[PDB]
């Protein structure tokens, strides 16, 4: 037996949301990093209706993250961040 106990936990969590007079007025909200390993029975709708997805920022994202994280700075008044956005192709908010 491997991971059997954790599997029983997962089954109980699944069962709490479906079958015989469901919970009613409760909303859940989940997150993950590598979702390919999620179980099919958990990803079925009726449990996970929407599958919002967060991707790497494009270009307005980068300049706008710069605007947000640098707006409390004592810096020069005549620098342009668009060049800074161009200089980093695929990067996350953390890097900014």
């Amino acid at each position: 037996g491997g991971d059997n106990e954790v599997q029983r936990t997962m089954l109980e969590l699944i069962n709490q949301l479906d079958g015989f007079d469901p919970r009613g007025n409760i909303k859940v909200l989940m997150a993950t990093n590598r979702p390919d390993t999620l179980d099919p029975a958990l990803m079925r709708p009726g449990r996970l209706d929407r599958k919002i997805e967060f991707s790497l920022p494009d270009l307005e994202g980068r300049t706008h993250i710069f605007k947000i994280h640098a707006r409390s700075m004592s810096v020069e008044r005549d620098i342009r961040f668009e060049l800074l956005a161009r200089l980093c192709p695929n990067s996350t908010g953390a890097e900014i």
Partner: protein, 48 residues
Amino acid sequence: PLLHPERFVNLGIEPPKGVLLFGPPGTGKTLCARAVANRTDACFIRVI
């Protein structure tokens, strides 16, 4: 649906119940959860 629980009941729909957030590390999902927690009014139980 919580702050306007009349539009859906009037027209005759029941809103969804779930949502999943996924993406590469550092992208910013946990921060969205914090934002939601700040805004709301009903309880909010966090589990890891």
